[model samples]
Target: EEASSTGRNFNVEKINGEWHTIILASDKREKIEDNGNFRLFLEQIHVLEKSLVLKFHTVRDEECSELSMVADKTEKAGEYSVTYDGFNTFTIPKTDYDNFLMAHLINEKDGETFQLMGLYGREPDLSSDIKERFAQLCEEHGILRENIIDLSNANRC
Candidate 1:
């Protein structure tokens, strides 16, 4: 890891009622792809490349996932989307859900701050060019390609 040299602060918004952070920065986006659980979640979608609905628990009274568990009205975030089907839970959109995850993640380390990556490991076989895309993403975020490495390939046990 290296110092993030530039870019605007990642934003937070009240998606429905609870606080949520929108990952509008490339660093945040790139940082997030590094998460094992998240990457697996994403990869499965792309690998299947078909219509499927998968729901997992995202609510807890702690941090970001807290909102998933929170009770709400009108799926307020639904109003912004045509596919959200606001009649159900104040949950999320069904269409483009992966992209939805890309844009919004609830809970946080704190206000104006959140985790780009989840704390898990042993990632699935990712898209072959993940690193290439990540390099480009880091560049957009002002983190140079030179500072990043394939952790598995690095000089360590």
Candidate 2:
């Protein structure tokens, strides 16, 4: 499976030697030209069980190289620095990656892959759409509103 085509899709790497976790939230499409772009951009997220299944993305290969060795080894273990179109920086605990990363990849003709860097759950300045969806997700998964963590602490790269 060639799984490099999902917007909610993501991959971690050291861009220009700097640590980064890239999550794609947009793509070209035929829409009514709403105020938003062709892709569905995810700003805030919902974590459940181990983590929230924030959104769906088709994956082919998922690697856990440099980043895997250090899981649960960092102070920033449950954070997420979501970036898109060259924009990013909201550190959470690094554990966000694993739970989300634990997210399975389909169409495996390509196989498993991993990237280097980053975390998990925290609160963030979320949008109404994300908040709404997140609430639903938690409910479906049996998580409580009071238990949700904030992940809106955007950081600079």
Candidate 3:
């Protein structure tokens, strides 16, 4: 999506719960031509997105045992771009900014899968146990349970 007109108000609805990367360069021709590190960077971003998704989904499903599965599969998958650090710094087109943010949030949510599981410092094998632990951790961390609960409810009914 074009980033010029959207501004930074990410529309979470359109995100598809996935992360995406956009190669932003003034000179597309030159950027694509000498794209050495940039190409590698893009590749890394893709890898990160996949890893994040796997981890987050596993956690969401309460398959804590597979917490490290993505990392084991791809050592570099652990690396990711946080919204505050990476997104905020990049000069994305205003039009695409919301789309980009939505995509980034989906990706970030996916990437945080393992870390979220790590809250209990162990894998949760059962749904009940995972839910209980998640609640406790959220309370301990002062997490905004409203958004999570609301979203989960929306998914259910």
Per-residue lDDT value at 5 in model 1: 9
lDDT of 1: 0.26
TM-scores for all candidates?
0.25, 0.24, 0.23
Task: Compose the digit string of candidate 3's lDDT tens values, residues 29-112.
Answer: 221123211111111111333333222211223222222112212222222333421221121122232223211111122333
Ranked by TM-score from best down, the candidates are 1, 2, 3
Error of 3 at 125 (Å): 14
Candidate 1's C-alpha runs over 4 A off are 1-109, 115-123, 142-157
User: In model 1, what are the clashing residue pairs, if there are any?
Assistant: 59-69, 64-106, 64-107
Comparison by lDDT, 2 against 3, better one: 2
lDDT of 2 by residue, 1-157 (tens): 1111122232332111112222211111111012322112222343332322233122123311111111111123333333232222222211223223211111111342222111112222334554555445444544455444332332211
Which candidate has the top score in TM-score?
Answer: 1
CA-lDDT, candidates in order: 0.26, 0.26, 0.25
Error of 3 at 54 (Å): 9.4
Candidate 1 per-residue C-alpha lDDT over 1-157 given as tens digits, one digit per residue, 9 for 90 to 100:
1111011221212111211122122224443244422321221211111122322223123222211112222324322111221212212211122222222223233244322221111242223354354445545546554444343221111
**1 or 2: which has the higher TM-score?**
1
Query: In model 1, how large is the Cα lDDT of residue 40?
Result: 19
